[PDB]
């Protein structure tokens, strides 16, 4: 279990704050730099609040970066 496992969006935490903690826990880990982006995305899918999880599952497959997912959530939530 990597340092992201402990990181899940709280019942009253804004997604951006959840994203911040998570990105922190991923960036300070032993993962190679090149591996951070795709791990961050999986965590967004698995560790967010349920409403946010369905939002990310419905999203266009053309969102490829953590930054596009964040922007998508903030605009549409």
Q: What is this entry, summarized?
A:
This protein has 77 residues and is mainly alpha-helical.
Explain the overall architecture.
With 77 residues, the chain is mostly helical. The protein has one domain: Retrovirus capsid C-terminal domain (Non-ribosomal Peptide Synthetase Peptidyl Carrier Protein, Chain A). It is 62% helix and 0% strand. The chain has 4 helices and no strands. α1 packs antiparallel against α2 (33-47) and α2 crosses α3 (50-58). The chain starts with 14 loop residues before the first helix and ends with a helix. The PDB classes it as viral protein. Keywords: alpha-helical bundle, capsid protein, virion, viral protein, retrovirus. The assembly is monomeric. The entry is titled "Crystal structure of the C-terminal domain of the Rous Sarcoma Virus capsid protein: D179N mutant, neutral pH".
List the helices and strands and how they pair.
Layout: H1 15-27, H2 33-47, H3 50-58, H4 66-76
CATH class term: Mainly Alpha
Net shape: globular
- CATH architecture level-2 label: Orthogonal Bundle
Individual helix count: 4
Measured between the Cα atoms of the first and last residue, the distance is 30 Å
CA radius of gyration is 12 Å
- Give the name of the CATH superfamily: Retrovirus capsid C-terminal domain
Q: How many structural units, i.e. domains? A: 1
Predict the CATH topology: Non-ribosomal Peptide Synthetase Peptidyl Carrier Protein, Chain A
Helix content range: 55-70%
Backbone structural class:
mainly alpha
The helix-strand sequence is: HHHH
Organism: Rous sarcoma virus subgroup C (strain Prague) (RSV-Pr-C)
Protein name: Capsid protein p27, alternate cleaved 1
Site (Involved in capsid protein dimerization upon acidification): 30, 42
Subunit structure: Homodimer. Homomultimer. Homohexamer.
